[PDB]
Amino acid sequence: ALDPLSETKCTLKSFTVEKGIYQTSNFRVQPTESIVRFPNITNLCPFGEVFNATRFASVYAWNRKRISNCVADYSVLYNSASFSTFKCYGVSPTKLNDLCFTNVYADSFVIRGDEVRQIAPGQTGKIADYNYKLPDDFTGCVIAWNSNNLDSKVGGNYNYLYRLFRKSNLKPFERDISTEIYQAGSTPCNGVEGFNCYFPLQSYGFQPTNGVGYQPYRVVVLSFELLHAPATVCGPKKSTNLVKNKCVNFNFNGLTGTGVLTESNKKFLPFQQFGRDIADTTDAVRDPQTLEILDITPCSFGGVSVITPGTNTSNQVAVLYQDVNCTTWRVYSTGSNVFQTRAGCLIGAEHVNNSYECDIPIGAGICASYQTSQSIIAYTMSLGAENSVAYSNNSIAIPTNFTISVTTEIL
Amino acid sequence: PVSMTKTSVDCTMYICGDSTECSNLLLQYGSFCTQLNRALTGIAVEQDKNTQEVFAQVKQIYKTPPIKDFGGFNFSQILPDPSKPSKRSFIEDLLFNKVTLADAGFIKQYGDCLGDIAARDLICAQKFNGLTVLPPLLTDEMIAQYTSALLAGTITSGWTFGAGAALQIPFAMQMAYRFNGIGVTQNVLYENQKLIANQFNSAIGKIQDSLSSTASALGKLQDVVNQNAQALNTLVKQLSSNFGAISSVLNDILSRLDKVEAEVQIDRLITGRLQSLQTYVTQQLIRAAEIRASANLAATKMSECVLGQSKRVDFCGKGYHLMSFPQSAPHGVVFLHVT
Amino acid sequence: FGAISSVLNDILSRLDKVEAEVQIDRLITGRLQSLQTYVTQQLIRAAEIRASANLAATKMSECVLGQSKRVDFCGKGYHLMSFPQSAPHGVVFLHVTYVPAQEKNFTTAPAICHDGKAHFPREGVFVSNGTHWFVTQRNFYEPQIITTDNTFVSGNCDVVIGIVNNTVYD
Amino acid sequence: PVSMTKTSVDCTMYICGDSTECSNLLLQYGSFCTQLNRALTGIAVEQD
Amino acid sequence: FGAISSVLNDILSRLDKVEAEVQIDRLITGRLQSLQTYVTQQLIRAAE
């Protein structure tokens, strides 16, 4: 990374470079600042209303609560909430503080200790089939904690029920609260229970002396989408000022990237937050605070070539920027000799009016050479010596001698 | 066709963009990017080599004669006009106007691609993904000058300048010897000189009219340019493929997963984009081999039809070959075969 | 290739069969891709080498086994002969050719009118050294007296443009 | 030899057959099948 | 191609969507690579 000559040395995997022109990496602009743009929300998410609820719902009638316009600072749960199970599927836990969530829904219920494992996208079992099923492409986090000190009674807590004997497996995120009598045998039932007809709901025991597998467990499943919609629930990240027309790192509603932000003429629809090009890259974004549309442009741009007479001859090099017009410049350095040929700006080579045979092909009719102090010179290549034929309507040229030439062709 | 578009690929820019973690992971491959760049550099050098072989056969630059007394034969349509900034012929101007290149020039500045133009402009999208287009070593003006020298030599000297030491000869006697070369006595040429000159002028005018009309007949060069542009656009478009990962955007994965969980997705994306680059380079190599064969044929035709009279049937036009005249064209050559 | 290591021995000594299977599969896929790329490049280079060898065989047939009239196919100039030589993975052709060396200016005419009829050289060109007219071959200056043996008569002198009058010997 | 056999490939049929899930997953590639078919069509036209 | 089986039907009948997704992706990648190799060889033979 010291200079284009060293980059060419590294690319060639050698300490010596022969005479010529070598394409290096494109011109790179490193970000200068880092900015975070989150919607201005001060209210904390209802952690007490979810994890501290006095009464929880049954698994067959699991409760769904919408979470919106809040900051998910889950560290407040560190004081009093201890969770036996905390598994996130569509997001890494360590990134949860740097993201914004679109449609946050908390599904709360109470199950057995042995049935906690059944709360997963691809599990089978009584709860997974008849009570609560997670989608295969589930994005969210499942949290479960033992509640034996709350949901257990000495005589037996029978307020929590689970669905048994269902005709077919439940669809993902589907709720069945019907109490119709199940027909296990071939004999039809007429609303009464007997022999092969049973009530579909059965109550848990939930006694304090029960085993850890038979003890009550409170389960909250948080489901949300990421980096696709406006979103209104955000992490505990402090927003900074908006920087435009500069190469910066940006964190827009959890979407991180690097680029230059400029004012955009695009008119986003009210339900749209991000814009993408034909390459699926985020090229437009709506500011969560000012509600303005900003175009994002990559910082790196422009091909770079390095011309050297050979490390065995000299260490002097010339730099050609194929997408820079020298008439601040997007160049590594601008030292004295600046020519600005076609096909880019040439820095480090002295332009001469003389025409020679091409030594190092720069391009667009421009060549470079190492001439005599010794320095790199750039010139327009000569097509050949100029001639005129003494043509006339009554004049001819006839040879009076000849030469026997022997040439060599290598194939 | 003589040459094709020379391209260079910044593999780190294409695969990873500005992602530092993705570049660090891509460092575990290393040699594949170097191999692709070596193949692309070989193709780019071969393009200039083909152009030099086709057009720089003679190193002895002959100018247009002042008098232009060629026994009734008119070459102003294939001779340059100094009024044009580029010293190319009127037919050469027509050929240049009938082929549309992807980019008018070769310098697209950062300010020109800043904003929404990074998406609307295909060149901006290609360059923002590490795909650059290198200009030919020889400009159109120099190729026009080489064609000018060849035409001046073949009209003033005939075949002698192709063997060195150009010898002047009146164009009527050159036509007489060319008639003798196809089995027709020179008295036929001398007794029908006005008629032959009139027919040659009429044929040149007919070619000019055909070129000036909507009939292009220059589909090969346009096909080459469109193939190169389509290959670059497909390379740009293939960046939206997930390759089995959760997303096709490295930024979304990095903001969505930690290092360990995002490593597999970034590896999948890197493998897919490397495969896309390899496919593009292989297709470019095959097309470069085809273009090299075409350029070798063009150089052979320039040697055997412009620098001399060929006895090979249907090698320099249909009929008994008399002479040929070269003309430059975007990424190609146009031979006017007089038979 | 996305694996924990590029050495199969390290993976085998570091992981059991199930855990090492994915790493070995990744390495196998990467090395197979490398071999495929090498073979494709070898095929392209072999096609180029085959084209070069076909050109070399054609040049051996048309320049060594015979004299070629094709311009610049067997060297620069008027081809006389060629000699082959072996070389490591290639052939070297020594092309012996005839090149005009010393040109001289002459006044030339398309035809000569002697007795109301046009005469033509039928082998070369008519030239004048200032006062007298001769007929000579085009590639070498060998002036000869213009006679009926080296000329043929075709038509009158009122049609040929540039015809001059000179004596034709019998 | 003058011409060779002209071939066409149904990439979805070859990769996935009659599997709907496999075709849905293959939809995330898209352009590679089109590129292969374009090359094959070019070869077929070149034969004629 | 590193998957549990070379048959998509066996994987689909043997695994759910999430578990079969990786195997189907591996098979898709392998078959796409095979098609690409066939097309490249066809292009070289077409040039010849």
Ligand SMILES: *[C@@H]1O[C@H](CO)[C@@H](O[C@@H]2O[C@H](CO)[C@@H](O)[C@H](O)[C@H]2NC(C)=O)[C@H](O)[C@H]1NC(C)=O
């Ligand atoms: C959703 O409701 C439909 C109709 O009420 C259910 O389909 C019925 O399924 C039973 C057996 O499970 C059959 O005997 C009926 O003939 C079906 N009727 C129709 C119209 O399809 C379906 O099973 C229900 N889905 C879930 C997940 O409970």
Ligand SMILES: *[C@@H]1O[C@H](CO)[C@@H](O[C@@H]2O[C@H](CO)[C@@H](O)[C@H](O)[C@H]2NC(C)=O)[C@H](O)[C@H]1NC(C)=O
């Ligand atoms: C050679 O052809 C050119 C045409 O390309 C002739 O130029 C034309 O001349 C006529 C009158 O002489 C004008 O009406 C046209 O406009 C000219 N066309 C141009 C300039 O493109 C030229 O006269 C011809 N040479 C001779 C000796 O007749």
Ligand SMILES: *[C@@H]1O[C@H](CO)[C@@H](O[C@@H]2O[C@H](CO)[C@@H](O)[C@H](O)[C@H]2NC(C)=O)[C@H](O)[C@H]1NC(C)=O
């Ligand atoms: C040979 O062909 C030429 C060209 O087709 C003939 O010349 C034409 O003659 C007619 C009159 O018979 C004129 O109207 C045309 O303008 C001439 N064309 C040209 C280009 O000058 C010629 O008559 C034919 N016959 C002979 C014996 O030459």
Ligand SMILES: CCCCC/C=C\C/C=C\CCCCCCCC(=O)O
């Ligand atoms: C009130 C619900 C708000 C939900 C907002 C959506 C996503 C935010 C994410 C995770 C919050 C729950 C974390 C529980 C575990 C804490 C860490 C631990 O003890 O291991």
Ligand SMILES: CCCCC/C=C\C/C=C\CCCCCCCC(=O)O
């Ligand atoms: C008598 C043994 C028959 C075995 C037949 C072979 C395969 C059939 C498969 C699984 C049966 C055991 C399921 C135990 C767990 C039930 C669901 C749950 O509670 O989570």
Ligand SMILES: *[C@@H]1O[C@H](CO)[C@@H](O)[C@H](O)[C@H]1NC(C)=O
């Ligand atoms: C939950 O309730 C306990 C007991 O009242 C309390 O100590 C704790 O702070 C509460 N936590 C939240 C997040 O409300």
Ligand SMILES: *[C@@H]1O[C@H](CO)[C@@H](O)[C@H](O)[C@H]1NC(C)=O
């Ligand atoms: C808060 O966000 C709203 C967007 O709904 C915006 O209108 C307002 O200006 C913001 N306030 C501050 C102080 O940034």
Ligand SMILES: *[C@@H]1O[C@H](CO)[C@@H](O)[C@H](O)[C@H]1NC(C)=O
């Ligand atoms: C650079 O800009 C100037 C105008 O400021 C223009 O005249 C010149 O042509 C440009 N350079 C190139 C190579 O086009």
Ligand SMILES: *[C@@H]1O[C@H](CO)[C@@H](O)[C@H](O)[C@H]1NC(C)=O
């Ligand atoms: C013939 O004369 C012209 C001038 O009329 C001169 O330029 C040319 O060099 C002469 N040719 C030779 C071979 O001397």
Ligand SMILES: *[C@@H]1O[C@H](CO)[C@@H](O)[C@H](O)[C@H]1NC(C)=O
């Ligand atoms: C031309 O040649 C003839 C015969 O060779 C000779 O007699 C005559 O003097 C020559 N004239 C000149 C001007 O050399």
Ligand SMILES: *[C@@H]1O[C@H](CO)[C@@H](O)[C@H](O)[C@H]1NC(C)=O
């Ligand atoms: C050359 O042109 C002149 C015009 O002045 C003419 O007199 C002469 O006869 C012409 N010569 C030939 C050989 O055509």
Ligand SMILES: *[C@@H]1O[C@H](CO)[C@@H](O)[C@H](O)[C@H]1NC(C)=O
């Ligand atoms: C040749 O003879 C004709 C007729 O005798 C005459 O018109 C012409 O002028 C003569 N040539 C010269 C050059 O005088």
